[PDB]
Structures are given as structure tokens and as C-alpha cells.
């Protein structure tokens, strides 16, 4: 009754109220609303009243006591939420509540809760309906896309915690009886969020797409064997994002289809130019995506090549693009893309001499590691099996590198193996 | 295969190309098979001048633009790849003097794969001109201005591919003034279309094509890229006021499809803001309110440009630090503290934010000292930031249990990488001593297990990052709460007749300020479990930090959290160096002595029955209390003449009912 008569004491009127009720939580250890919750949603409404009236008017913004009492009301209201058996409906009214401000998940008075219904204890049969009402809530279009980023945190955090603290989705799917979130993943794929893959109207965020990139991604990790037509809908949903205009959504969906096709459902009209435009020069924002995508991709493209794969034309893409790079950071990107795989290139001797020239052009820092690691690659290759001047370039580079200057000791060991498979006067030259 | 053995083998292109529709697999063995890898024994002079005829006869086949890929137009970019990898010290004229009459066809038109040959070959002609000084840069600067006056036609039909970089970074400097700089400026005021200003009303697509909007913001962007190099040694005149609204006008509508141009668009802003007379009027023309995250609405692309977007602005506010009134600097703390607490950014960006928060504070006491009618709001201003420090290393106390997980992973990774040093070849003893002996539950790691982890898992020292954060932030916090002392009330309200005993000792705070002091002490004394002279530095910084703290307002922190400090001491013993530093050298050891003896007198009633650990701790803690009455003793020795006789006699009766009755008499001898 005395908020709209003055308009500036509303900080000192909310903080006193959470003072009083926070006192009366302490002297009634059970609850002083019968653990039923009518006294406190007036406080959530009260928070929206004072938060609205500070966003409206002028003078006092971001006081100390509001920064405290939001984190106090958060603690008692969120303390109530675990003290009831209708545990799923008051969890999300708070997510409607922080729509204005109040921290993107001011944690441990709100996120320590959200960890407690993540899968521990391992077979509690109540988080099923948490994921159910969560999946109905993320599909609710009329509420707060940033709080749908909050919904990424709850849904995909509890799913990848299940994947982490189990083998891979062992404790679900009781003969596929009431998941009731895979069919909302059929709302996901069977809507496709058409036409442009998220919501042509002004959204202010690009997050929900990356949610369904992760939540789409986890099932190819989790259960690649149970219901594979649903994962074909995961293909035709995730194959569409490749036609986008940024990089680290294009290489992210491109990563997860690069993760898929090792499992099953192998085409050849797509996969070839998929890793061709993985070995095509992308720029430096998501190089590590190209690292894990190509280096986890490439073994199945060695085994699903052969029995029809007499050519190494798919390796001739690597040769020709390695010519095309106009040697820079771009070839350096590909050198560990023929190093993080080692045991199965073994094709020809075209990779050797030109990359020895590159590896001479390294040392004219942070790039020496690739230079010595290339010598570990060739040292692997003549140990995988077990025309002279290129060996003089390699070995004589190693003499010039040791005589020039952790890793140099490894160069001493590499030289210590290579020679039994320049001579005298060059030592005369050497604060 | 680097001599004329090559020339005996690439005779398949001793003609220009037979079957010109299939040149791309018949005569493209030049830089793709042969030239790119051989040697350099000065052989290029002998035959590059002999393949300039093959170059020009291959340049006979650019007649027609508009989507003729296979005979002509990807062979165009093949000829780009022919030109782009040559450098020498001879015969610049048989390329430069004939290239531009072969590049003239493509430059005004832009539709259906053209508009690139004169430009992107002009990268190669440009850099091949950069090696020499043949003084015809003004002779063929003309067509560039012809492009920059052909632009309004091209935006009249199409409601660009200028790429202004490699024209005017010649840097030769007998250059002209108004044609070049007007060729800069006459692209500024051009509306992209007229529709987007009608979009602009409620931000504080409706054009038919959107790809041309990309093509024109890229050109206006590259405008904003170039003229800093026309500014960075170069004083400018006659116009300085057209730039700021052009900058934020250019940042405000850039497409979320790509922010790779936004990178050195923002470098191109910090070069403007670094220079002297292009600082002050940008508050006068933008007022800094247009510098929020409107510059980043492409967030999956603008999640890797978040450090650079704030380092320029924070270094800009630190760069001006003049005529900053109080409302905009409280705005800067209420956004930069949020940038501190936001975990997802970085570590060094957070410490940069904290350093920015301290480096303003002299303007807070100077600004609050100039017009003291708004002085206590500068005080509360000065404490929002220390609340943010407290929350910042309150998060570390929570992240503790997994910090030691990744640290245990760090030394179990260190001892399997630094063990290879032990088997080195430089040993020169073993074959001599052996010659002698011949002749004789995952709490927080959710983010690191997601299928899109987007970057490698971190592998540094989390402890050294924590200690960097504590020494850094505590090291600021000293002089912050030291400099609180200039905002105090006068003593006449407080009614004390010891005036010069103030101005270093006493302050006065509200409740929601001494709470943040208490949880500063609490969530700093919890923080010592990571850590031991590096710990001792924080013992000294907290100790020295609370000398300036109003001892009657210091006693209430330590009466209520000294039992917590006590139950922390029972596991690690070093925290006595906390209490030692509170009473071996202070103003207020006549307070901490009495508080410590009130606690220990309460915990003497039984406490020799207990085990060796807390008996060792208590029997040290008494001795540190009585070593604070021989150092100082022209102080309140009257802190100890109460409860010392009861310590004697009650230490006798508790010894007759104890379980280890010698510890009480050892306490008597250490009295």
C-alpha cells in the first residue's frame, strides 16, 4: 500500500519483506506455509512489481540491497520448491520470473537445485516428468528464448550427465514405454522450425538452434542402434544446417553429421564432398571442430572406402588442396590432419619432399612442435614398414636445428633413429 | 626434375592450350605440379619470360562475363592462381604495362561471377608494384576513382567488390589530397537502401535482395578499414565530425551471417580511439550509450570476438578519464562488474575488468570530493565494486572441489611429460661410477563432456590462476578500502574528542556494507585452502586489509567468525599466522587479544581431555595471546588483569578433573 505513494522506497520495501519472511523460515523449520506455497508467490509477484518500477523510473538502479535480496528471495522460494511433491510446476514460474533481469541463472541459490534432480539418485522415477514438462516448456513459443537457453542447461545437462555417469543411456527406455520426449523430438524434426531454421521474427539470440544441435547430437553418441529411422530424421534435420552462412554452426552440424556416418546409413553422394569441404580451407574460429571432425571422421572413410575404394582419389583431394593452400597457416592446419591420423595414409611419396620444404620454411616460436612432429611422422612411416637428396634435407635440417639453437631432445632421439636406415666440415662454422 | 628434364616433359603445353574447354587438367600443371615445390637456383629468369607469351595467349580467353564457368570463368580464377605466386628482381614492365588493358573488361560490372579479375589480380599487380618504385602509381590510380564514382550508378540499379585495402596502402607519400580522401568520404553518406532508416525507429528483410546489402556494408566497412592508415601518421582537417555516427551507424546494422569483418572493423575503431583529438568528441556525438551488445547480435559468431569488443571500450574509458560525470561511471561499474562475474568470457578479460574498476577510483574520490553534496553516493559507488570482488572469489570457493580434480590431473600429466627429461644423453657420471663399481561423481564438469565442446579442455594450473586472482584482486582491494577513509562524517556528529585518531582508523557503514565486509572476510578465509609464502601474502593482505576497519566495526566480524576460523585451524595449522598478524603488530591488538582470550576461556572448561591436535592448536593460541603482552606492553595490559587469576585456579581445578592433566600445568609455565 505504500509503494505507489512515493515510488522511491521500493528497494527498502522489498528487502524488509524478504527480511521478515526469511526470519520466519528460521523459527519454523518445517515450513510456515504448511509446505504448500501461497505466501511466497506474492513475493515473486512483489519482485516483478519492484523490478518493473525500477526499470520504469530514473534514480536508483542496482543498489546493494536488491543485489542481496534477490539472492535471498531466490534462496527461500527455491528452498520451498524442494519441499513439495508437486516438484515440477513451481520450478518454471521462477523461469518466467527472471525474464527482466536477475542474473542468467544466479547459481547455487538456483542451480544447486537443478543439479539435485539430475539423475542422482540413479533410478529415481520422477525426473522423467521433469524432462516431459521441460520438453513441453521449450516448445512453448510464447516465453523467453533466453530462458530456453536455461532449458538447454536443464535438459541437455541432465542428459549428458546420464551419458557421463553410465555407459550410454542404460538406465532409460523401459522397453520404450512412455519416454514422451522423443515424440516431442518428432515435434522438433516434424516442425523443422520452418522456414528459416529459427523464427524469422526478431529473436535477439541464436541459441535455440545450437540447443537442438547439441540435443540432436547426444543421441548419436547415446543410442545409435535402437530406433534408427528416428536418427534418419536426425540426419535430415541436421543435414539442413550445413547450408548456412556462418562457420561454427556450419562446422558444428557438419561435425555432428561427420560423427553420424561412422555408425550407419552410408551415402556416397554427400560424404565425399563432406570431408572434401572439411579438408577445404576454413578460417580461424573453429579449427578444433575441424580437428575432431576430420580426425574422428577419417578412419571410417578409410574402411568404408575399400571394397569399392581402389583409388586414393579421396587422398588426392588432400594432395591437391595441400598444393592449393599458398603455404601459410592453411597448410599447417593440414599437417596435423595427416598427423592426428598416422597409421593408414601409406599411399605414395608425394607428401614427403614438399612438406620437408614447408618444414624448412617453419624455422626462418610456437610452430617448432609441428616441425619436429613431422620428423616423428616420417620416423613412424619407415617404422611402419619396419631418392637421397630429400633425406639430406631432412637430416641436414635436423643437424642445422640442433646446432642452431624438451623438444630438441626428442629431435636428438629422432636423429638417433633415422641415421642407421653435413658429414664433416659443416661443423667448422659453429652471446 | 628441376633442370631442363622438366622442359623435356611439360611439352604438352608448348602450345597455349589445345582443347581450351579442357585446359584445367591439361595445362594447369604449372603451379599445381611443377613450380610450387622444386628449388630456387636462379632458374625462373630463364623461362618465366618465355611463358609470359603463354600467359597472354591464355589471357585471350576472357571475352564474356555472366556465368560461363567451364571454358572461361573458373579458368579466370585459375589464372588468378597463375599470377599470385611470383616475385623476382627483373622485368616488371612485361606484366604491369600489359595487364591493365587485359583487366579493363571486368571492373564496373558486378553481376553473375565477375568484378574480381582487375581487383584480385590487382592484389598481385599491387604487391609486384610494392617491391619497386617505377612512379606510375598516380598514372593508374585513375580507374580506382572511376570505380568510386561508378558506385552511385551501381547502387541506383540494384536497390560492389571495391576492396579498398590494396589500392592505397602504397605509402609512397607524394600523394594527392582531395581526390583520394574524397574517394574515401563520398561512400559514407550513401544510404544502403532507403528502407533500413525506416527500420531504425524502434530499435531504441524488407529490401527485395539482401545479398547486395552484404556487398555494400562490406565496401563501407572497407572504407572504415582503410582511412585509419590514411590517419595513423596522417593529420586530417576540414572534417572530423562525420566519423562517429558513421562508425556506430556501420556497426549497428551488420549481418549476423558473418562477423569476420567485425574483427578488424573493431580494430579500425580502436585505431581511431587511440589517437589524441579523436577521443573527446565521441562522447560529444555518441554519448557512449550506443556501445552496448548491439554490436554483437550474431552471438555464435560473436562469442569469439567478445574479449576484443570490450578491451577497446574499457581501454577507451581508461583512456579518457576526463569530464566523466558520475552517472556514466556508475553505469561503467554496473556493466563491467557484470562482465567480471560472467564466467564464460575468460580469465585475463576478468582481471582486465577488475583493473579497469580500480583505475577509475581516483576519479570517484576526486569527483566526489569536488562537489560534496553527492559524496556518499560516491561511497556506495565505491563499495559495489568490492561486492563484485567478493562475489568473484566467492565463485572460486565453490569451484574448489573440481579445481583440485583438474590439478591432480595436472601433476599426473606433468609427471608423464617432465619425466622424459630424466633420460637425457648429457649424464657423464654413470659410466664412471659404474666403472668404479666394475673395477672394485561429476559436480561441475558437465560443460567439458558436451558433444560440442568447441575448444580443447583446459590444462593449465588452476591453482596459479587462483593465486593470480587473489594476489591481483586483494592487491587492488587494499588501496580501495584504504581510500574509503576520505568520505567519513565529521566527528562532531559522532561526538568524540580524539580528532586526529580518526582519518585512518574509524569509518561508519550501513548494515548492507558490513555484511559485505563480513562475507569478504569469510569468503576470503575459506579461500586459503588452495594453498606456503604465497598463502602468507594473503594472510598479510587480509591482515593489513583490516587494519583500516573501525575496530568496533572490526570486532563484530571476528567475534562471529573467529569460531569458524578456529574450526578451520584444526585442519590446517598455518592460519595462526592470520591471528599472529592481528595481534603481534596492530593498532588494535588491545581488541583481538581480549576477543581471543574470551574465546579460549570459554574453550578451556574441558579442553585438555581432547586429542593432540586441538591441544597443540590451543596451547599455541594462548602463547600467541601472551606474546602480545610482552611486545607492546605500554598498551592495555588491563586486557589481561581480568581473567588471569581465574586462568590459574581454574586451570588447577580443570587439571584435577581432566584426562591429560599435564597440559594445564604446561599452560601455567607458558604463562
Residue numbers in the entry:
A (entry chain T): 1653 to 2016, 2022 to 2043, 2089 to 2107, 2115 to 2130, 2138 to 2146, 2154
B (entry chain T): 1 to 159, 214 to 258, 287 to 522, 558 to 648, 676 to 815
Task: Paste lines from the article.
Despite their differences, both complexes have integrated the large Tra1 (Transcription-Associated protein 1) subunit, an essential and highly conserved 433 KDa protein that belongs to the Phosphoinositide 3-Kinase-related kinase (PIKK) family of cellular regulators, which includes mTOR, DNA-PKcs, ATM/Tel1, ATR/Mec1 and SMG-1. PIKKs are protein kinases that have diverse regulatory functions in transcriptional regulation, DNA repair, cell growth, metabolic control and mRNA surveillance but Tra1 is the only member that is catalytically inactive, due to loss of the DFG motif within the kinase active site. Although lacking catalytic activity, Tra1 is critical for coactivator function as it is a direct target for multiple activators and enables the activities of SAGA and NuA4 to be directed at specific genes in order to stimulate their expression. Tra1 has the domain structure characteristic of PIKK family proteins, consisting of HEAT, FAT, FRB, Kinase and FATC domains arranged sequentially from N- to C- terminus.
We over-expressed and purified S. cerevisiae Tra1 from its native host and determined its structure by single-particle cryo-EM to a resolution of 3.7 Å. Sidechains were visible throughout the reconstruction and an atomic model was built entirely de novo with 3474 residues (93%) assigned with excellent stereochemistry, representing the first atomic structure for this member of the PIKK family. Using that analogy, Tra1 can be broadly separated into four topological regions which we have termed Finger, Ring, Clasp and Head. The Finger, Ring and Clasp regions lie within the HEAT domain, whereas the Head region contains the FAT, FRB, Kinase and FATC domains. However, although the relative positions of the catalytic, activation and phosphate-binding loops of mTOR/DNA-PKcs are preserved in Tra1, the critical residues required for ATP/Mg binding and catalysis are not conserved, and the Tra1 activation loop contains an 18-residue insertion compared to its counterparts in the catalytic PIKKs. The relative juxtaposition of FRB and kinase domains also differ as the DNA-PKcs and mTOR FRB domains are positioned away from the active site cleft, whereas the Tra1 FRB domain occludes it, contacting the LBE (mLST8-Binding-Element) on the opposite site of the cleft. The FATC domain is integral to the kinase domain and is sandwiched between the LBE and the Kinase C-terminal lobe, forming a plug over a large hydrophobic cavity within the kinase domain. The interface is localized to one side of of Tra1, primarily around the FAT domain at TPR repeats T1-T7 (residues 2572–2830) but also at the C-terminal half of the Ring at repeats H41-H44 (residues 2150–2350), which clearly represent sites of intermolecular contact between Tra1 and the remaining SAGA subunits.
